[PDB]
Design an enzyme around this catalytic site. Structure first.
Site, PDB file in Angstrom:
ATOM      1  N   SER B 371      -0.608   1.919   6.408  1.00 40.24           N
ATOM      2  CA  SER B 371      -0.866   2.399   5.052  1.00 40.24           C
ATOM      3  C   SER B 371      -0.009   1.564   4.110  1.00 40.24           C
ATOM      4  CB  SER B 371      -0.555   3.884   4.913  1.00 40.24           C
ATOM      5  N   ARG B 372      -0.424   0.316   3.886  1.00 39.86           N
ATOM      6  CA  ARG B 372       0.236  -0.506   2.881  1.00 39.86           C
ATOM      7  C   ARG B 372      -0.069   0.005   1.485  1.00 39.86           C
ATOM      8  N   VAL B 373      -1.110   0.827   1.353  1.00 37.34           N
ATOM      9  CA  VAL B 373      -1.335   1.549   0.108  1.00 37.34           C
ATOM     10  C   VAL B 373      -0.164   2.481  -0.172  1.00 37.34           C
ATOM     11  N   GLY B 374       0.367   3.121   0.868  1.00 38.11           N
ATOM     12  CA  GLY B 374       1.536   3.953   0.681  1.00 38.11           C
ATOM     13  C   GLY B 374       1.210   5.298   0.049  1.00 38.11           C
TER      14      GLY B 374
END
Lengths: 53, 501, 47, 469, 486
Positions: B371-374
């Site tokens: 989840s680089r979206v975070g």
């Protein structure tokens, strides 16, 4: 009991080494199997690619 | 090359000068009738990748082109095809009717229903020839999306317009994952916020007639299918058909989301798309590659994935969201589809079917999802809870295989992981999720045995709802860190857990 | 061929999992030791 | 002449031109297409129609489409003047700002540095990076390969290093999103706007924007290699400023020429690549760098997709990478952040004649210590720290501490990593190394050294732990 | 039109030159195109000849009438390039200009036969301790060099050259020899460092430049084997001992691979065709000494082997092993474990033979290697370390002492007799009490003490080549003073 312990550890390691060689046997068997398998697999891939040409 | 018309089939009229009358722009005879690999006598003035309409109504997708012969696509089961057949090339990039009249209507990519719900009511025909969004057109997007599963929203926060990629193999609940998202996407779509009210897209490629009917029963049962688009490429879905089904989703997403629909597309699996395009290229005798698959599937699949844009202010403000689900071969990360997605995806989810093999259902591959979206598209309350929860679950995993204080920590983390579990087909709002999150951050039942906690968690959700469903909606609408709702939660937690024993 | 140093740990299987877990146990013992020693040192520096 | 659409499955097109085939590197525009469709003549097949490298979508074309023959590669202006907008290799300024026209305009196909006329020295291009300085200090204008994977910190460490160095480039600079995400394109646009090393409205552009995005097909996505080589030559002379160059990513780029080879019918390499895909890529690596009137502090990303360490693609990568940046994705899996492959990456500034005897010796001893850490790790896995020898348990703690002190959370990372960046001083790094060699925290927890800057800052963190305990 | 010794470009692409004409042109000749491109064709089709673009022919448009100059590969001969940086095309390397080399030797050089071979007896100037210790290189030897990325392979080479260049700068009548070593597939920065150091290490005094750049033409890469073969043969038939270094080797393999691939010749395993035997061994088998009849020169060869993740089964490596009269196994983890030199010793091997082995150094190695194996024999036990059997403990300490001595210094060749002396002191057990962490600096300091004082005895042994028991004792006492006094 300490001598029993040391001897037990030794024999235990012995049985362990036996089991280890056993596992490694079939391990290496399938290992060469898969080795040649992937080798000829890439080979056949290239062969077909040549056929595609 | 084999002179296709080197036979008197055309050469007779050539030496006899009798061939001149052939419609040589967008029609003619079949320069090659065979295997659906269509070469057309003439129609050299036809557009490239244009539409071809056989005299038998069958649609042709001319991709390869001899000077007048071609490689066109038999859009159907052509057991009746004939030599020299006439394909009146429609000369057009493929398009089909679009509009949320399809949202709640089960038609095909060309607008073809299979369930008997009527002709394509979707409004306008859209050519899927859609390119990438513009730098002016695109900007950062961080709005939440419907996740609805505890850990799902917890660590891989669902962004409005985020393109998922959920690693989970054959019979890994991947379909179950999609259904859970839909049930989560239901209450969001079952909401008055037109941004939340999602007229969205979800599909499972290779969904045979039985799979299609079962999924239809489910989706209609969800009634979110009303605000949803669901096409099931059954066991006979054509290689062109399944191949452009993702392109169909691309055009549909341009339609709604580019018109500001905060909407999501769920198509899988592009591995089957590779199989279909490779089937074509084999029929095309085109140069093969790894797994005979073309290496240019990168840009081809990029046409869908790499154009990932959540509709910004310039794009209507909605979201053109994607939710891929990856399926490992044998954990074959370097599989053509797998390596490609790895080489492609910027963010991806992973499920641990081994934990499902361990029995966990659900069983997301902890850590293995990315989840680089975070947390920027999760509740800042959920974000705050997750700040701790990340380390908590990490330590629970970090020394899972058994200090006593460390033993206390491990017991708490294991119990927390047990609590985070969810049933089968049970997605809901993240409110009770954040409730249990507060419970764990307080360790509200870490003394209750996980087996005791097994029912204590349900009792806690129940007594909280019967105690703070109002405060639940309060923390919900407020969103921010509700210290007042926090103390109400502490009290109702003493109630639910302490009163549970 | 050759065998790596920590070759199993390099592979890190269930054996490597045990390596990690025992690292956790022993290093945590030593960590509680170092932390307690530091608490004692802080207590000493208090006066 | 003027080519005319003849027969092609798409871009692999020999267009009927009345005269013969133009010279090599010929890139001609399709007259009669939707947009300016420049196609590169690439197959000297003759026949007045050369199977030409078309970078654009071929759909809609009708056979007989008579196209504009140019005869050479794309010509667009260059130099530090074009800096400030974002332009295509064809020159197409995709910054929604129309042609950001510069002065130095030319074709792209050219030679490499001369056998006697380049730069012949190596100057440590220090940046104060914890791990990098700690072991593998870089150098000026060399072939530094960034061995990292996809989603593997390459863009994350890239953001950290951009924040670190890019704000203060020696001269102007360049950055290429070669198959970067379009979402990443817009985000990087907002980031440059908020970055100042290149300023959108303002002329603070000590940097140059470039995009070769993934949604851009290989025909462009595989082609920007010469564009980057020419831009580097410009920064050497035309832009003429001490420039570091960013370009990511090349894995899909060399793979893109590979995918092109099939249309070329070109021989599949071991990974199916073009047989001369390596020839070009190595030659691509030979174009523009530090020279007498040349200088390119270009940063080269070494993408190891599918984590295939020995990839034939990684093979060609190691083949010319004058500096190595070996990530240890396992370390990151262990939570390392930095997470490089320590005993693996090579850098010349790590030498007793270069790093100094002290620093190089310390780094080598660190490598030996970590090797022992790994070795004894499995040994423990057998036995465990119950048999931990005096030299051993000591070695175990020391190695754990070295690993801890290795990483640091950055301020751009503080977005996720929470902890803001620590500008690691070189002397501070070497001092922490010497102190750890002594054992600067024997009574203390190594976890303070984890994700930390200076070793003294770690001592402070351990004291903070003593408070929080 | 021309159809005997001039062709006209029929159909091309990626330099795939098959021209119309020059049918009567001879085979395997580097001839000028219509763009004057002196290039070679091999694939003589019934209708044409497949010509390799000798580099990039962007100056050649289609239809070009290539004039078959009938000119085969001919490259210069003679030591004029010893010290001079030149490229194989008659060009310079570092831009070092005309080496004063005038001639050009046609590709028609064959390997020497058994009679044309000469027995090898030269102890090689290796500048790496274990290199000369375990197995130096004979007069014209053939030993593989297995290695990986930045593996120190060129560094071991530098140790050798630094040991070699002294006599290359020197005159020792049996050490008079010719030197040429390839930097094939070399980055511009790498080659520049190479030339700069050759100057700095004075290796640019008697060395003929060999290298293939990263931008070097694949046909150039291919001819580079032949190029080095002819270059060596120059001084070899000129009686001068010569040296080759196929460094690297795999690159030219991939090169000819791409070549025949364009040629649509059959790929073979890993697309590698039989020339890996045929073309590669065609130069490889010549790694010998030209007979006294063949001049008495020695044709040494130092091929470089890239261990692609230790691709031990490389068909490249496959041919190499079946061809290797020697190989360089490297325990790179040891360098990663600090032990640089990272010797994969039990792994290392050399089939060249000991006919070029100093019976003094041979005497030293006879015990050193046995002790090394015996240490290696139970070195696993060292892990536990505790309760070491006294024989085992002593064997380990000898091995421990050696491990202390195991390392090596980049660009740091030394006297071979110095290493012989150090090993002799060990054989005396005279190092048994030196702490291994410091025993290295110890041996180094004792070495300094001798090179000042016993430098007299050093030359005594050296010129002697015979270990006088008295001279042995004199060195022993000099060392005992140096060490007890260390």
């Amino acid at each position: 009991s300490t001598t029993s312990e040391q001897s037990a550890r030794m024999t235990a390691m012995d049985n362990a080494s036996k089991n280890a060689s056993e596992m490694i046997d079939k391990l290496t068997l399938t290992f060469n199997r898969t080795r040649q398998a992937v080798i000829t697999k890439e080979l056949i891939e290239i062969i077909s690619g040549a056929a595609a040409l | 090359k084999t002179g296709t018309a080197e036979v008197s089939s055309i050469l007779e009229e050539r030496i006899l000068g009798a061939d001149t009358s052939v419609d040589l722009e967008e029609t003619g005879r079949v320069l090659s009738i065979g295997d659906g690999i269509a070469r057309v006598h003439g129609l050299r003035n036809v557009q490239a990748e244009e539409m071809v309409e056989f005299s038998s109504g069958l649609k042709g997708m001319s991709l390869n082109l001899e000077p007048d012969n071609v490689g066109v696509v038999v859009f159907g089961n052509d057991k009746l095809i004939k030599e020299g057949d006439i394909v009146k090339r429609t000369g057009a990039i493929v398009d089909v009717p679009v509009g949320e009249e399809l949202l709640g209507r089960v038609v095909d990519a060309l607008g073809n229903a299979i369930d008997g719900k009527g002709p394509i009511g979707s409004k306008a025909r859209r050519r899927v020839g859609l390119k990438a969004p513009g730098i002016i057109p695109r900007i950062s997007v961080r709005e939440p999306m419907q996740t609805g599963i505890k850990a799902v929203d917890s660590l891989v926060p669902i962004g409005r317009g985020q393109r998922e990629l959920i690693i989970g193999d054959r019979q890994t609940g991947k379909t179950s994952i999609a259904i859970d998202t839909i049930i989560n996407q239901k209450r969001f779509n079952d909401g008055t916020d037109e941004k939340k009210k999602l007229y969205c897209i979800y599909v499972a490629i290779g969904q045979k007639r039985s799979t299609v009917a079962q999924l239809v029963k489910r989706l209609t049962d969800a009634d979110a299918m009303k605000y949803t688009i669901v096409v099931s490429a059954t066991a006979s879905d054509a290689a062109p058909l399944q191949y452009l089904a993702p392109y169909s989703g691309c055009s549909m997403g341009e339609y709604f989301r580019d018109n500001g629909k905060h909407a999501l597309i769920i198509y899988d699996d592009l591995s089957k798309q590779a199989v279909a395009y490779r089937q074509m290229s084999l029929l095309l005798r085109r140069p093969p590659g790894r797994e005979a698959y073309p290496g240019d599937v990168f840009y081809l699949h990029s046409r869908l994935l790499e154009r990932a844009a959540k509709m910004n202010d310039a794009f209507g403000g909605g979201s053109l969201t994607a939710l891929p689900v990856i399926e490992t071969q044998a954990g074959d990360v370097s599989a053509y589809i797998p390596t490609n997605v790895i080489s492609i995806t910027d963010g991806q989810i992973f499920l641990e079917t081994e934990l499902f093999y361990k029995g966990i259902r659900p069983a997301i591959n902890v850590g293995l999802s990315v989840s680089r979206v975070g947390s920027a598209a999760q509740t800042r309350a959920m974000k705050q809870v997750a700040g701790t929860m990340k380390l908590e679950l990490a330590q629970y995993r970090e020394v899972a295989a058994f200090d006593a204080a460390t033993q206390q920590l491990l017991s708490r983390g294991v119990r927390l992981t047990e609590l985070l579990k969810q049933g089968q087909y049970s997605p809901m709002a993240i409110e009770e999720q954040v409730a249990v999150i507060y419970a764990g951050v307080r360790g509200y039942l870490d003394k209750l045995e996980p087996s005791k906690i097994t029912k204590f968690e349900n009792a806690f959700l129940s007594h909280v709802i019967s105690q703070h469903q109002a405060l639940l909606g309060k923390i919900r609408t407020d969103g921010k860190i509700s210290e007042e709702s926090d103390a109400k939660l502490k009290e109702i937690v003493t109630n639910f857990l302490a009163g549970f024993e | 061929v050759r065998s790596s140093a920590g070759a199993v740990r390099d592979a890190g299987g269930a054996f490597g999992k045990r390596e990690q877990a025992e690292e956790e146990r022993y290093f945590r013992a030593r960590a509680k030791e170092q932390l307690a020693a530091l608490k004692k040192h802080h207590e000493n520096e208090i006066s | 002449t003027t080519g005319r659409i003849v027969a092609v499955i798409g871009a692999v097109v020999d267009v009927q031109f009345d005269e013969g085939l133009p010279p090599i590197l010929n890139a001609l525009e399709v007259q009669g297409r939707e947009t300016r469709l420049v196609l590169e003549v690439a197959q000297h097949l003759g026949e007045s129609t050369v199977r030409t490298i078309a970078m654009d979508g071929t759909e809609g074309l009708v056979r007989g489409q008579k196209v504009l023959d140019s005869g050479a590669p794309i010509r667009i202006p260059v130099g530090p003047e074009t800096l400030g907008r974002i332009m295509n290799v064809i020159g197409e300024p995709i910054d929604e700002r129309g042609p950001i026209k510069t002065k130095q305009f030319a074709a792209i196909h050219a030679e490499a540095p001369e056998f006697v006329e380049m730069s012949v020295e190596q100057e440590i291009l220090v940046t104060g990076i914890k791990v990098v300085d700690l072991l593998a200090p870089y150098a000026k204008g060399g072939k530094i390969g960034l061995f990292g994977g996809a989603g593997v910190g390459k863009t994350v460490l890239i953001m950290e290093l951009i924040n670190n160095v890019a704000k203060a480039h020696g001269g102007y600079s360049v950055f290429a999103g070669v198959g970067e995400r379009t979402r990443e394109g817009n985000d990087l646009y907002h980031e440059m706007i908020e970055s100042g090393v290149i300023n959108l409205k303002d002329a603070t552009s000590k940097v140059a924007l470039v995009y070769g995005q993934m949604n851009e097909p290989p025909g462009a996505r595989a082609r920007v290699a010469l564009t980057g080589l020419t831009v580097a030559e410009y920064f050497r002379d035309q832009e003429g400023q001490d420039v570091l160059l960013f370009i990511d990513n090349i894995f899909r780029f060399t793979q893109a020429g590979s995918e092109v080879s099939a249309l070329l019918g070109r021989i599949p390499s071991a990974v199916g690549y073009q047989p001369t895909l390596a020839t070009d890529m190595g030659t691509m690596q030979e174009r523009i760098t530090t020279t007498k009137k040349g200088s390119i502090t270009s940063v080269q990303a070494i993408y190891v997709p599918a984590d295939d360490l020995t990839d034939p693609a990684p093979a060609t990568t190691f083949a010319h990478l004058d500096a190595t940046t070996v990530l240890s994705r396992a370390i990151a899996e262990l939570g390392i952040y930095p997470a490089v492959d320590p005993l693996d990456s090579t850098s010349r500034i790590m030498d007793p004649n270069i790093v100094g005897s002290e620093h190089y010796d310390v780094a080598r001893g660190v490598q030996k210590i970590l090797q022992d850490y790994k070795s004894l790790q499995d040994i423990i896995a057998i036995l465990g720290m119950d048999e931990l020898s005096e030299e051993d348990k000591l070695t175990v703690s020391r190695a754990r501490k070295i690993q801890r002190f290795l990483s640091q959370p950055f301020q751009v990372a503080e977005v996720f990593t929470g902890h803001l960046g620590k500008l690691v001083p070189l002397k501070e790094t070497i001092k922490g190394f010497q102190q750890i060699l002594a054992g600067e925290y024997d009574h203390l927890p190594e976890q303070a050294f984890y994700m930390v800057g200076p070793i003294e800052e770690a001592v402070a963190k351990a004291d903070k732990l003593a408070e929080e305990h």
